[PDB]
């Protein structure tokens, strides 16, 4: 029960016969998972957490880097990956579902492995992740610093399917989402108008919504999604909303989070991304590593 750092290992449901790339990297370097769920619930116990300084994020990063590197020296469908604590250490799991990833958490649990997380490299929006339970969440190291990213957890899933390109979003689901987000931002930012506008500039992956499907890279136009005013009340001003994807040479998935950036009478937020570690921070906000005392 002492906070520390140590090398972790991965658990896979990998099958040796499958030639899918996530399998072949996992078969070699991920040990078989444990059927026993394991659990150790605690309560009225407080531990400080900081999702923005967690070495667990860096460890998944270097694995996926090596995964992609050795994979692309065709199949490509990720596997949910479990990251597990070694002997002498454990993983603390904060349980306040209203937790924002920083400060004290009064409800913890003890696990030796993580929940299944498949690695999905993307920008602007987080896909196939873990939905936030109950309320929608807002996470940043410093909201005062415009440069620091803002991760928004989705408590209601929106299905997204793009085929060989265009993308499909139900307007009813999306307009629900933005109204809440701006309302949460209205709590975090006073009196200020709160607009959503597309990426001002940068690389193609950041300016579009980029993702990989079955091995082919898709970059989708986001000017249609980020186009609203959402002040007192709500209002979206764009043309089911459809986005334009560029193939470079279908996927049934659901969005689970947002990535935003603020410019510094109105406060405007734009889609972002790039550091795939923040994609990993979306699924690792709960876990911390401690040394058994």
């Amino acid at each position: 029960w002492k906070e520390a750092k140590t090398t972790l290992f991965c658990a896979s449901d990998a099958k040796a016969y499958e030639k899918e790339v996530h399998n072949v990297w996992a078969t070699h370097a991920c040990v078989p998972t444990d059927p026993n769920p394991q659990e150790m619930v605690l309560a009225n116990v407080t531990e400080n957490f900081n999702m923005w300084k967690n070495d667990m994020v860096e460890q998944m990063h270097e694995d996926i880097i090596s995964l992609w590197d050795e994979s692309l020296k065709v199949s490509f469908d990720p596997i949910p990956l479990h990251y597990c604590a070694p002997a002498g250490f454990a993983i603390l799991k904060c349980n306040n579902k209203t937790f924002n990833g920083t400060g004290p958490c009064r409800n913890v649990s003890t696990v030796q492995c993580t929940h299944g997380i498949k690695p999905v490299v993307s920008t602007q929006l987080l896909l196939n992740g873990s939905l936030a339970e109950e309320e929608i969440i807002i996470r940043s190291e410093n909201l005062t610093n415009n440069a620091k990213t803002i991760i928004v957890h989705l408590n209601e899933s929106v299905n997204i399917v793009c085929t060989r390109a265009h993308c499909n979003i139900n307007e009813s689901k999306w307009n629900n989402t933005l109204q809440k987000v701006g309302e949460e931002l209205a709590k975090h930012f006073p009196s200020k108008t709160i607009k959503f506008e597309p990426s001002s500039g940068g690389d193609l992956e950041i300016t579009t919504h980029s993702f990989n499907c079955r091995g082919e890279f898709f970059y989708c136009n986001t000017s249609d999604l980020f186009n609203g005013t959402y002040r007192n009340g709500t209002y979206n001003h764009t043309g089911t909303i459809t986005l334009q994807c560029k193939i470079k040479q279908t996927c049934n998935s659901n969005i689970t989070g947002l990535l935003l950036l603020r410019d510094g009478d109105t406060e405007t937020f734009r889609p972002g991304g790039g550091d795939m570690r923040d994609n990993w921070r979306s699924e690792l906000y709960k876990y911390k590593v401690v040394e058994i005392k």
Epitope: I65, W68, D203
Partner: nanobody, 127 residues
Framework: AVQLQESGGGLVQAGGSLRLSCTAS????????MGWFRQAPGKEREFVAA????????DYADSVKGRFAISKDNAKNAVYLQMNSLKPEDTAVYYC????????????????????WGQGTQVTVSS
């Protein structure tokens, strides 16, 4: 991830030249960009140069185009910045950086927010 260490900084007379080097620990995979940044006294950090790890395509800040050259040696996991015709406005701490871009569409390197960072090497250009 990649651990970076810069070298080569120091004092140089106006008009002189200096070559900076940066080597990582840890293998650099095919989708990385490597770049150089600098921070002058009391000023914000700015882009200097970048190079694509696999393709070798370069980009230079307008302030340094012609005067600096970025190069690489993949076998050594090293990147270099040859600085010629140095001027007092180049006095700064120079940082080497890496940016993993697995979803890049082209080989052209970025000039935006790099995510992995070295400790810096100081370059002082005397008037």
């Amino acid at each position: 991830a990649v651990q970076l260490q810069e070298s080569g900084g120091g004092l140089v007379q106006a008009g002189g030249s200096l070559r900076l080097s940066c080597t990582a620990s840890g293998r650099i995979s095919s989708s990385y960009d490597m770049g150089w940044f600098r921070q002058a006294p009391g000023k914000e950090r700015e882009f200097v140069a970048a190079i694509s790890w696999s393709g070798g395509t370069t980009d230079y800040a307008d302030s340094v185009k012609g005067r600096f050259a970025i190069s690489k040696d993949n076998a050594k996991n090293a990147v270099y910045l040859q600085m010629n015709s140095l001027k007092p406005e180049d006095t700064a701490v120079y940082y080497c950086a890496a940016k993993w871009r697995p979803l890049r569409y082209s080989d052209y390197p970025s000039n935006s927010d790099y995510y992995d960072w070295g400790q810096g090497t100081q370059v002082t250009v005397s008037s």
